[PDB]
Design a protein around this ligand. Structure first.
Ligand SMILES: OC[C@H]1O[C@H](O[C@H]2[C@H](O)[C@@H](O)[C@@H](O)O[C@@H]2CO)[C@H](O)[C@@H](O)[C@@H]1O
Length: 461
């Protein structure tokens, strides 16, 4: 008879190309029209291109400018050169031919169909983390599978993910401290994690508890992070063990054109350890001290992550409060630094909030099994976490196999010291409203708008 046989269907990265070819068992001269139709899962037939015996070629608006329908009457084949591909293209492509038999009537002919897959693995992780190293793991994944792994780091991703991932597509996998994940889980923005016992057993059982909401695993634990006191050993060999002796040290250092302590005052995660050192009466004590530092001109009013980091790395401030991730940038600079216990306030220790960096799969993602493969077999491995860690340090990784290397690092010891003096954040959905209440409270008291007693009043509501 005159059967049509399609070919060239495979997997490709968006922006890549594919040449579909449909050969017939008869001369294409006899056909009136030849063309390509596509069908995506659960959708109607969509014509993409057609070519008539008159050499006129038409295309659908989505593929127009990107696809060309060609014909070779010698090879008895119709082609579809698909250039600059997109995820919307993903579908089963079918070849169609129409023929006018010698009389008035016509004959429609179809092929088997050829599957075309345009998949891209997109990861959202914060810009203060090791996205370049995470990309080196993503580059090894594409070598062993053929899937593209792009790594994105957009600003305000913790509050841009639940808006974009709900409505739009957003990322496949989202990386953030475990505390934000309960709100995503309650809203239905995260797929339930189902890792086999052998993978499950590779990580510390306490780390899995942080990524659990209502008896369901909602993410993969990566690493335990806690803030420590980072100090310049040359400007300050015996740094303050107490918060209350910093004003004296600052008077001493300001005479030599140097600050004592500069850290991010805008984000409440950095000011919370001082606020929670005693506790209420503890929050009032801790914050009043922080307010007195800005009131005594020891710290700047709008001290943010960048000017604090830059000032410490430049060698302008003797101390800073930051996490594991910040160390690599200090190593890049020529600063002999030390990481140590956070200063004590009112004798008791400053209790930082402990975060578990965790990777969750977006509920509205088609690549859920491909992301599980990346996370399990490529990222959460001795080799995978080493790549991320040599870019920007992860802190105390959740991988059991890393115990000896973590224990050999003095900065990890100081991180674990502060993590024990602190406490793990509950993952609850109210954490977002809580953090916002503390973010405003600290900024208002820092700038000089609301009083310390009125800040805890508005925050407890
Ligand atoms: O600032 C409040 C903010 O703090 C925590 O976020 C940390 C994040 O966990 C760290 O990995 C680091 O990058 O800095 C963030 C603060 O700058 C909480 O996880 C987050 O919910 C909260 O908004």
């Amino acid at each position: 008879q005159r059967q049509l046989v399609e070919s060239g269907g495979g997997l490709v990265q968006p922006g890549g190309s594919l040449r579909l070819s449909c050969a017939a068992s008869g001369s294409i001269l006899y056909f009136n029209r030849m063309g390509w139709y596509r069908q995506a899962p659960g959708k109607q037939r969509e014509l993409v291109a057609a070519i008539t015996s008159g050499d006129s070629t038409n295309y659908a608006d989505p593929v127009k400018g990107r696809f060309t329908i060609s014909r070779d009457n010698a090879k008895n084949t119709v082609y579809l050169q698909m250039n600059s591909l997109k995820p919307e293209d993903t579908a089963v492509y079918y070849c169609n031919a129409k023929e006018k038999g010698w009389s008035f009537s016509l004959y429609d002919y179809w092929g088997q169909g050829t599957p075309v897959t345009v998949v891209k693995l997109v990861i959202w992780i914060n810009g203060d983390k090791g996205y370049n190293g995470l990309a080196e793991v993503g580059k090894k994944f594409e070598k062993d599978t053929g899937i593209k792994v792009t790594v994105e780091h957009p600003d305000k991703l913790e509050e841009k993910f639940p808006q974009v991932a709900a409505t739009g597509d957003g990322p496949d996998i989202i990386f953030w401290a475990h505390d934000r994940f309960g709100g995503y889980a309650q809203s239905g923005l995260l797929a339930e994690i189902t890792p086999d016992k052998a993978f499950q057993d590779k990580l510390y059982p306490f780390t899995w508890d942080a990524v659990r909401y209502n008896g369901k695993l909602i993410a993969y634990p990566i690493a335990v992070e806690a803030l420590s006191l980072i100090y310049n050993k040359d400007l300050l060999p015996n740094p303050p063990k107490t918060w209350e002796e910093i004003p004296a040290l600052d008077k001493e250092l300001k005479a030599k054109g140097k600050s004592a302590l500069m850290f991010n005052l805008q984000e409440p995660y950095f000011t919370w350890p001082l606020i929670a050192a005693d506790g209420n009466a503890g929050a009032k004590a801790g914050l009043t001290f922080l307010v007195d530092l800005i009131k005594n001109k020891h710290m700047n009013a709008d001290t943010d992550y960048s000017i604090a980091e830059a000032a410490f790395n430049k060698g302008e401030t003797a101390m800073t409060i930051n996490g594991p991730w910040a160390w690599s940038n200090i190593d890049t600079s020529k600063v002999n630094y030390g990481v140590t216990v956070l200063p004590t306030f009112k004798g008791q220790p400053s209790k930082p909030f402990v975060g578990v960096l965790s990777a969750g799969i977006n509920a509205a993602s088609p690549n859920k099994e491909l992301a599980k493969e990346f996370l399990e077999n490529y990222l959460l491995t001795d080799e995978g976490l080493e790549a991320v860690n040599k870019d920007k340090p992860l802190g105390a990784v959740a991988l059991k196999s890393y115990e000896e290397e973590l224990a050999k690092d003095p900065r990890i010891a100081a991180t674990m010291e502060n993590a024990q003096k602190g406490e793990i954040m509950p993952n609850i959905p109210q954490m977002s409203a809580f953090w916002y209440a503390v973010r405003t409270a600290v900024i208002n008291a820092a700038s000089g708008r609301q009083t310390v007693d009125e800040a805890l009043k508005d925050a407890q509501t």
